């Protein structure tokens, strides 16, 4: 049907998905609850991660895979898997790990278990090519099929939305992940201590602490940050009215 058609015309099946009640006040409660954005330039290879406190309710981990530059310092899964993520994750906490679409779908699960998480949801970023159908993909040798998506694995430890993200393939060498991942995360109401490892200037954002090597500016102060969650704010979901 549609896979016969992609072998015909160059349009990925997902080019044809359409539409891609008011939970709007929720977004207002996230926005009122949101800490000011904090950010910190740090070479995470060389950075004692422990210096990040307190312990985080949510970690979004977007390490720069060598596969993202399949056309244009890359981390191997060797490197990622040595991160001491378990040291900064709150006893009950969540992780969202961008795994790409190769070995990462396997190695990333080794990581989720190495750090104490169970996989909860596999969220797929499905990339349409409505604006450049005549440009197929240069496959990994191991590949059987054209690879046209990326996976973001969700993990939990301790005790409304869909698992699909449909957008158009970024330009070769643009590596930004769909901003929609932040909405999915924020709508879960998991806690207000949110950490984005390997974020960039372009990803800084209210409600989040961003740490990554390419940041050009930093404003992080552990005491200033900690101050945002002292009582009576320690346990808010991020989705409630702030305590007066």
């Amino acid at each position: 049907d549609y896979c016969q058609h992609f072998v015909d015309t160059g349009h990925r099946p997902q080019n044809f998905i359409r539409d891609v009640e008011l939970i709007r006040l929720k977004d207002e409660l996230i926005a009122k609850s949101n800490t000011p954005p904090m950010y910190l330039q740090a070479d995470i290879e060389a950075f004692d991660i422990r210096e990040l406190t307190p312990k985080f309710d949510v970690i979004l981990l977007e390490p720069p895979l060598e596969e993202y530059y399949r056309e244009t310092k890359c981390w191997t899964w060797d490197d990622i898997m040595k991160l001491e993520i378990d040291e900064i994750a709150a006893p009950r906490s969540f992780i969202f790990l961008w795994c790409g679409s190769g070995e990462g779908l396997d190695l990333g699960r080794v990581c989720l278990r190495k750090w104490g998480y169970r996989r909860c949801e596999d969220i797929c970023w499905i990339k349409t090519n409505k604006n450049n159908p005549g440009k197929t993909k240069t496959l990994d040798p191991k590949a059987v099929f054209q690879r046209t998506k990326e996976h973001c694995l969700m993990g939990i430890k301790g005790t409304v939305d869909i698992d699909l993200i449909i957008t158009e393939e970024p330009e070769i060498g643009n590596i930004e992940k769909p901003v929609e991942i932040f909405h999915i995360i924020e709508h879960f109401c998991l806690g207000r201590r949110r950490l984005h490892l390997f974020g960039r200037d372009s990803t800084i954002r209210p409600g989040w602490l961003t740490v990554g090597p390419t940041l050009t500016n930093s404003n992080y102060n552990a005491e200033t940050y900690a101050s945002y969650f002292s009582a009576p704010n320690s346990y808010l979901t991020g989705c409630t009215e702030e305590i007066e």
Binding site: D1, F6, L105, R119, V144, F145, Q146, H151, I162
Partner: protein, 202 residues
């Protein structure tokens, strides 16, 4: 012999050695996922114990996974001697082309792709890892996957495990316990079957 063949049986106890080698294996097993059960499941060990490795020397395995079977299927895949090299997802739509564990609503189904040995002469790259198709009936896999498999490895012998009567397909041998008897046509298969099951009962 090109046309549909099938064998009603318990895949646990059937001697799959008689069926020979297959360029492609597909299975949509009844994993023992988070309780429920509108059908009878296999335990983890029975899935580990399945005799997939006799079925191929070089070729591909297509393994449907859901829930915790996403991790368990990766284990069986590796124990059976395969390496996962791809992963197809099916996006479930309605007849007007819109989309239809605890934390998120599932819009998709996963099918791991595994390779074993050194398959040669395959049209790797023709399709993409995404299927979009209407849900024809509950718990049914979309026909598009057979198209993708045929394009991948045209003309070759294929076997489906845990298929149901609608899954019968040219070039395929379907195994399933709700199938209508035993319909076989390829002589060598009919030979090793009569030699192994003279009185025809697993």
């Amino acid at each position: 012999l090109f046309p549909p063949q099938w064998i009603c049986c318990d895949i646990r106890y059937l001697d799959v050695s008689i069926l020979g080698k297959f360029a492609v294996v597909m299975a949509d097993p009844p994993w023992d996922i988070h309780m429920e059960l509108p059908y009878g499941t296999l335990t983890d060990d029975e899935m580990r114990r399945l005799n997939i490795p006799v079925l191929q020397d070089d070729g591909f395995l297509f393994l449907w996974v859901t829930g915790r079977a996403m991790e368990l299927g990766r284990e069986c895949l590796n124990l059976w001697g395969y390496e996962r090299v791809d992963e197809i997802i099916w996006v479930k739509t309605n007849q007007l082309q819109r989309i239809i564990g605890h934390w998120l609503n599932h819009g998709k189904e996963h099918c791991l792709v595994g390779v074993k040995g050194n398959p040669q002469g395959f049209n790797q790259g023709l399709d993409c890892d995404v299927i979009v198709a209407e849900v024809r009936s509950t718990s049914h896999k979309p026909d598009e996957i057979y198209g993708m498999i045929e394009r991948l490895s045209p003309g070759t012998r294929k076997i489906e495990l845990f298929g149901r009567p609608h899954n019968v397909q040219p070039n395929w041998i379907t195994l399933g316990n709700q199938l209508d008897g035993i319909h076989l046509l390829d002589p060598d298969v009919v030979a090793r079957f009569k030699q192994r099951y003279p009185d025809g009962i697993i």
